[PDB]
């Protein structure tokens, strides 16, 4: 089944890890634990206020 | 012999197909679970940070949670195998009613009656299975997310919204995922050892 | 999981199928050798009963 | 009975074996245990879906 | 002589058939054994990790084990030779009863 | 008995070994000794909690 | 302490798992070589009994 | 796992096979005598019909 | 955000595409080996039916 | 509807039909080949006795 094996779970981990490290940078670079996205829009809207 | 051999070849086929079903539902429940981790994060935040968050903040959270509900429901209503909604929470509710079960049978053995009986019962509305869905509590906190402003009224005072019941819905929802995946993986191991038998015995 | 499910449907045991391939070659060749022999015997007959 | 002997059962095995090895190739080459033919149209129609 | 020769040909046949039965049951018992290794893994875990596992955890384990039981029973109730359930545990229980062997 | 010999026990070992190395990767790639499957659902459900 | 507890549950002995990975590669490859040999022997038979 | 249509696909194949078995039993003649006429010599406990 | 949007349109899963590339090489080579075998069988036939 | 539940369609009866159908072919061929052997030994007798 050679043509069916790619360790696709590894590939999924890869996508996950790349986004993960990306997020780390974005927070590091910006100095923001807050998200740009509305994820925790409570805490965001607070800090906005 | 050949009748049984060929039946063992198709047995291996059927069992591998069993596995495919299993791992489908498995990965889906893993993602469900990951959501539920996020949910509990939002529950602890939906402790209102005590009183510090305002009603709008709880509504922002609740928008996020209802969004997550819609995703859980999406899992349970998109996870199909051959059209069979494998996370149809009403697929095999035992009910104490044999007539209404859709028993997830797997005929594997080349000999008659050699079948495996499996149970599906999870879905987005399936959270604290007290016996069934209780009401606003025990299921519909997973669906409707009681932490709107009722929480700010009684953050602890009445259990129904006093943070307690909600966290218990989430905890039990997770526990039901855990046990569902426990059954699921139990059958996974069964089919592993089955196939090993089918292979050796077939040889 | 779904591509794996498909893969189970289309699962080629490539080792099995190469092996079975090999066997069927062998069997074809053997059978043809015997067909030659089936053509040889009646020639022996022809001479012997001439 | 010289003109009647050809080991025709051997010939039948021959046809069988040639088709057999052919099928093996076709699956090997295509990487498909599935058939092109509707033999096991259940499993086929599944994989189609 | 030929009577014995032919009887030896069928003897070899019968003995090879013996072997086929043997190796059938053999491989089945090997798989059974492998399960039992997994079982003992689940026994040592079903030391509850002492007390650390909870009742539900023990039930998750027990679901797995009862599943394994069903597989062992499946071995012993699927391993047939010519229909003869070769791992019928009641096949030849000596019993001290010749009538039932 | 040429057509009956394939070292099928070797083939069974092959299937076993391929799944084995696969599992190794999956854990390595994900960094998870835990299973996705309910195998050790005790330890899983714990880590979930 | 809690993330450590989890880590114990999800503890990958990465060295073990790379090692075992290696082994299982070796074992797969070896077994396939033997499957080739299983396909070679009956060919030798074919010639020798032709 | 198979659906009703899948069972019907199978059943189409099987009924096809039935038609082939019936074809065997209704084409296997010797000198016209349908040798696999299942009603040829049903003993019946009736000598008159054998 | 816009260059990211484009990037999603032109998103190469480079790992996927190297993997699929690899596979298609394998598959091409395998198929050609089988084409050789398709040319070998009728030669065996030629000798055997000479 | 009833993959096992009633034997009539519960996979059991069907597999038993197939198994017995095969067994009836087996025994039919058993009789058939018994007579084959008979005619083998018959012909050997007819040949020797005829000689």
Author numbering:
A (entry chain J), D (entry chain M), F (entry chain A): 3 to 51
B (entry chain W): 52 to 254
C (entry chain M), G (entry chain A), I (entry chain C): 255 to 304
E (entry chain g): 52 to 152
H (entry chain s): 103 to 152
J (entry chain s): 204 to 254
What does the paper say about this structure?
There are three parts to the flagellar structure: the trans-membrane basal body that functions as the motor, the connecting rod and hook, and the flagellar filament that acts like a helical propeller. The “short” state results from a protofilament having a right-handed inclination (the R-state), while the “long” state results from a protofilament having a left-handed inclination (the L-state). To reconstruct filaments at high resolution, all protofilaments must be “locked” into the same state, either L- or R-type, producing straightened filaments that lead to non-motile bacteria.
While the three L-type mutants (E115G, S285P, and S17P) have a left-handed 11-start helix, the four R-type mutants (N226Y, A233V, H84R and A39VN133H) have a right-handed 11-start helix, and the designations L and R correspond to the hand of these 11-start helices. The L-type 11-start helices are tilted left by ~ 1.7° and the R-type 11-start helices are tilted right by ~ 3.9°. In R-type subunits of B. subtilis, the side chain of E115 in S0 forms two conserved hydrogen bonds with the side chain of N240 in subunit S+5. These two sites (E115G and N240) are mostly conserved among different bacterial species, and we also detected the same interaction in the R-type A443V mutant in P. aeruginosa.
